[PDB]
């Protein structure tokens, strides 16, 4: 019951999936061959970790996950890597030719050749569930597959599963690690196409993560491996309420109720603490009060933007580890005194809090210190729209000269789809302005 199916799309989605599933295995005590000695029910069960793992008669715990990419070389590393036994081969799906950083190839020319096979494999996972809750979809904004195939997939999932919930983890581009000049086009196209199909989307700004790795972990030039280990901790924080239970645990769906006041306003800002190196964490106790305060420091946000220049519509705190109610209540009291957190006039101001007692885990060879307690704040702030404005501006610069547009038109797209997508983004920015205005 309450199963969640994860779908990892394109290089970024797949590589982040690697990092997340490895971390989940460590958190639950699952070996790379999928055995879990602590699990006494063989071949099934309804424990909390079963929302994310099915089981075979032979004791294997198998991710409820599909990996899909339009070329094989990234998923091939999964197929031959450390966790190769973890996945059934049919969960790992590849084509031969990728989308070449072109939304149109991912959604149409190339994506159309594999979409039916992908849905068939998702259906096999869905059939195993006794109460499927929804999907978690991981993908880049910038890549041709991450943008175009994800959009196609989300549209097809709405048809095949109706309003079954679909959440996204979406990688927002940064120039330090970007690989295509047309990423703003792909970003706007996929955000427009997916908007009415997604219930909640957590944007992960690669520049924010890049900065945190440089500044907090003293990593000179972060790699995708550095970025993805940090990202996976944030994803783990957010999915922890689904995978563990405890008296103080609050389900992700309850946070979602508070976080989404209108269907289109569904992009929470995540902020995570503590991000600290072993060297600096040694002989340093980071209290509940300290990690909570860090949630309101924009340096720790997953998306670059300034909530102090915006208004809040909701604030959720997701704690894990050695965290007791009295300390959380005292920390929030302090914050409400010292920080001006301004809410819109039509929302209550109380923070919604969940606590999971299982402490954070780290993967061997990482740069993150292992800590006794951590927190992820999820906030609904008008400031998140800053991220749209930056992308929309880059789109506008190129589109005004129709730069690169012929690559899309040559694959069957029309200029009307570009302008329609950009107009939807203009309307989204206007929606975020409007919810911030005081009531009459």
């Amino acid at each position: 019951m309450r199963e969640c199916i994860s779908i990892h799309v394109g290089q970024a989605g797949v590589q982040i999936g690697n990092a997340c599933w490895e971390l989940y295995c460590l958190e639950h005590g699952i070996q790379p061959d999928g055995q879990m000695p602590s699990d006494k029910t063989i071949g099934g069960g309804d424990d909390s970790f079963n929302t994310f793992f099915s089981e075979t008669g032979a004791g294997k715990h198998v991710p409820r996950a599909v990996f899909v990419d339009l070329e094989p070389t990234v998923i091939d590393e999964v197929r031959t890597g450390t966790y190769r036994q973890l996945f059934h081969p049919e969960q790992l799906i590849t084509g031969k030719e990728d989308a070449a950083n072109n939304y149109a190839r991912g959604h149409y020319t190339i994506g159309k050749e594999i979409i039916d096979l992908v849905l068939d494999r998702i259906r096999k996972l869905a059939d195993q569930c006794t109460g499927l809750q929804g999907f978690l979809v991981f993908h880049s904004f910038g890549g041709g597959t991450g943008s175009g195939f994800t959009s196609l997939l989300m549209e097809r999932l709405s048809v095949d599963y109706g309003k079954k919930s679909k959440l996204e983890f979406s990688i927002y581009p940064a120039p330090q690690v970007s690989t295509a000049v047309v990423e703003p086009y792909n970003s706007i196209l996929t955000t427009h196409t997916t908007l009415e199909h997604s219930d909640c989307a957590f944007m992960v700004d690669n520049e924010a993560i890049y900065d945190i790795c440089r500044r907090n972990l003293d990593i000179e030039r972060p790699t995708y491996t550095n970025l993805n280990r940090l990202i996976s901790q944030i994803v783990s924080s957010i999915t922890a309420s689904l995978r563990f239970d405890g008296a103080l645990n609050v389900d992700l769906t309850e946070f979602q109720t508070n976080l989404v006041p209108y269907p289109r306003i569904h992009f929470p800002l995540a902020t995570y603490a503590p991000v600290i190196s072993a060297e600096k964490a040694y002989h340093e106790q980071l209290s509940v009060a300290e990690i909570t305060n860090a949630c309101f420091e924009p340096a720790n946000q997953m998306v670059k933007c300034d909530p102090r220049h915006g208004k809040y519509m909701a604030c959720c705190l997701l704690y894990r580890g050695d965290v007791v109610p009295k300390d959380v209540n005292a920390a929030i009291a302090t914050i409400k005194t010292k920080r001006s957190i301004q809410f819109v006039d039509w929302c209550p101001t109380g923070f919604k809090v969940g606590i999971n007692y299982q402490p954070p885990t780290v993967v061997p060879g990482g740069d993150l210190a292992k800590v006794q307690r951590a927190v992820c704040m999820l906030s609904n702030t008008t400031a998140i729209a800053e991220a749209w404005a930056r992308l929309d501006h880059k789109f506008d610069l190129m589109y005004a000269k129709r730069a690169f547009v012929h690559w899309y038109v040559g694959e069957g797209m029309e200029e009307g789809e570009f302008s329609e997508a950009r107009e939807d983004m203009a309307a989204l920015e206007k929606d975020y302005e409007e919810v911030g205005v005081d009531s009459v």
Partner: protein, 69 residues
């Protein structure tokens, strides 16, 4: 009150079904339009290349005509 309860749940079903229906139709429209556009772009490209072939035939025809004179 019971009639109202029935109406509310049938409304929920109808709106879910209509969402699926319109998603389904939008997608079929988009895919057909894309297919036709891409095929037309390829057709035009081939058409131009085939005109080059014809032109080349004329060039050789022209050379042959010049030759005996």
């Amino acid at each position: 009150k019971r009639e109202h309860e029935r109406e509310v749940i049938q409304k929920a079903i109808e709106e879910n079904n209509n969402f699926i229906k319109m998603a389904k139709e939008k997608l079929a429209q988009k895919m057909e339009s894309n297919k036709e556009n891409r095929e037309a772009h390829l057709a035009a490209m081939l058409e131009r290349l085939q005109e080059k072939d014809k032109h080349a035939e004329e060039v050789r025809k022209n050379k042959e005509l010049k030759e005996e004179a």
